[PDB]
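Bump. Still looking for Protein translation factor SUI1 homolog structure tokens.
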Amino acid sequence: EQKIKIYVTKRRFGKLMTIIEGFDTSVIDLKELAKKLKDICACGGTVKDNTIELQGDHRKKVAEELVKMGFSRDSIEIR
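Sorry for the wait, here they are.
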């Protein structure tokens, strides 16, 4: 059971980020995923530990792209 969580966060003194977590890092390369997602959202981003952080609110965009890429619709939750 892979469980993908997509949500928005704003750290203290920060700007709104979109966070994506729950991928199996031994099978999925987050660096390449992030690069692909950054093109979809046209924003900056990085792999932060075992998560991807994107600048701005792109929850729906990301979720839809992940489905396009073959990830289960039912494995993804937007919060």
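The two ends are 18 Å apart (CA to CA).

Edit: fixed formatting.
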